[PDB]
A paper describes a structure:
To gain insight into the evolution and designability of ligand binding and specificity, we analyzed the homologous PBPs, PotF and PotD, which are Escherichia coli putrescine (PUT)-binding protein and spermidine (SPD)-binding protein, respectively. They constitute the first elements of two separate multicomponent uptake systems (PotFGHI and PotABCD) to transport the cationic polyamines PUT and SPD across the cellular membrane. Still, the protein-binding modes differ: PotF shows affinity for PUT and SPD, whereas PotD exclusively binds SPD. Prior to this work, we grafted the seven differences in amino acids from PotD binding pocket onto PotF; this resulted in PotF_SPD, which will be referred to as PotF/D throughout this work to keep naming for mutants more concise.
All prior observations combined led to the following three constructs: the basic double salt bridge reintroduction E39D–Y87S as well as E39D–F88A and E39D–Y87S–F88Y. Upon analysis by ITC, an increased SPD affinity was observed for each of the constructed variants. Binding modes of constructs containing Y87S are again similar to the SPD binding of PotFs, revealing beneficial enthalpic and entropic shares. To our surprise, all solved structures adopt a PotF/D-like semiclosed conformation. Also, SPD adopts similar positions to the one in PotF/D in all structures. In E39D–Y87S, no specific differences to PotF/D are observable. In the E39D–Y87S structure, R91 shows an additional alternate conformation that can interact with E69. The respective R254 can partially interact with D39 and N231. This time, R254 adopts an alternative conformation in E39D–Y87S and E39D–F88L, favoring one of the possible interactions in each, respectively.
Residue numbers in the entry: 28 to 369
Write the structure that this text describes.
């Protein structure tokens, strides 16, 4: 009988031939579906009976569901290359998944500033503060960049944390007043200069020159940069992990508790743990993978990019998302609607 495997992953988060290569090597039929919204994935998981054997949630969402019985523990004896994973990244993911019981770290990155090098330098000068959140969180700078286009993510959790860190508050403040007060105060001063709040349109807009500065996910900004280079359109997109720090986050593979094809799922996970497999993915999607054995195999342009693989001094400035109580979640959501309506 045919062996089958159903995977649900983000768009633009695998190499073009990863699945084909796996099928050639193993004889397993893969059904590979994609989503571009975390809201979509989580709704399906909470409803249950998804039909997926492997899914790719955020590490933070995993914490919220470790008690909901959504996932089943990973049998590490079926993953002999588990030893290839970076122990430091396992520790960070274990903040949401104690003892790394349910999740295999896949890729990770930061939320920083993507920008058009030429347009930012034209408007703010040669010494534009591209190494600082000042570039996009000082109203005086956004007023000058307004005409060339400014985008923020449509993501209250990441944007509020970014603002709180910049203001010198706890990035993960549990104080409702921090969100409704100082954080909202700054966002309302910036708001008239922001063209839109959206978590994917900025990728193509950066690549085509339609916006000049964005809050964005590192690898997606690097994808925009590469798309502009492949189009030979002369647009120069870069990305900055600013000097004040930034949020780091981790996407993981996990196995729904009702998965029908568990043996095949473990074959695919151990396939991903082979160093060349995940290095090849990083080469194509411009995200750092969590496999320490894989790093030397990654192309120089990606591995040596400190906005993809940050060195120790930059990693020390990164913070991670803490899961908040529902009451803070709702304050955050309410305040974000007010910010956007401004
Ligand atoms: Cl995360």
């Amino acid at each position: 009988e045919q062996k089958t495997l159903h995977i649900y992953n983000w768009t633009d988060y695998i190499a073009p031939d990863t699945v084909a290569n796996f099928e050639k090597e193993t004889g397993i039929k893969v059904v590979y579906d994609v989503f571009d919204s975390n809201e979509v994935l989580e709704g399906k998981l909470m409803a249950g009976s998804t039909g997926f054997d492997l899914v790719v949630p955020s590490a933070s969402f995993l914490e919220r569901q470790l008690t909901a019985g959504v996932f089943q523990p990973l049998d590490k004896s079926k993953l002999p290359e588990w030893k290839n994973l970076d122990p430091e990244l396992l520790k960070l993911v274990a903040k949401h998944d104690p003892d790394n019981k349910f999740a295999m770290p896949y890729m990770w990155a930061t939320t920083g500033i993507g920008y058009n090098v030429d347009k930012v330098k034209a408007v703010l000068g040669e010494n534009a503060p591209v190494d600082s959140w000042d570039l996009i969180l000082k109203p005086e700078n956004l007023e000058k960049l307004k005409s060339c286009g400014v985008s923020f993510l449509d993501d209250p959790e990441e944007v509020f944390a970014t603002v709180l860190n910049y203001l010198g508050k706890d990035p993960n403040s549990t104080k409702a007043d921090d969100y409704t007060g100082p954080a909202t105060d700054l966002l309302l001063k910036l708001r008239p200069n922001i063209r839109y709040f959206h978590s994917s349109q900025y990728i193509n807009d950066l690549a085509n020159g339609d916006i000049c500065v964005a809050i964005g996910w590192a690898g997606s900004v690097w994808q925009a940069s590469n798309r502009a280079k492949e189009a030979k359109n002369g647009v120069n997109v870069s990305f900055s992990i600013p000097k004040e720090g930034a949020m780091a986050w981790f996407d993981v593979f996990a196995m729904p508790a009702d998965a029908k094809n568990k043996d095949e799922a473990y074959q695919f996970l151990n396939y991903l743990l082979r160093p060349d497999v995940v290095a090849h993915i990083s080469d194509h999607v411009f995200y750092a993978n969590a496999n320490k054995a894989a790093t030397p195999l990654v192309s120089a342009e990606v591995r040596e990019n400190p906005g993809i693989y940050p060195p120790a001094d930059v990693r020390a400035k990164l913070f991670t998302q803490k899961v908040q109580d529902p009451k803070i979640d709702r304050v955050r959501t309410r305040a974000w609607t007010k910010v956007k309506s401004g």
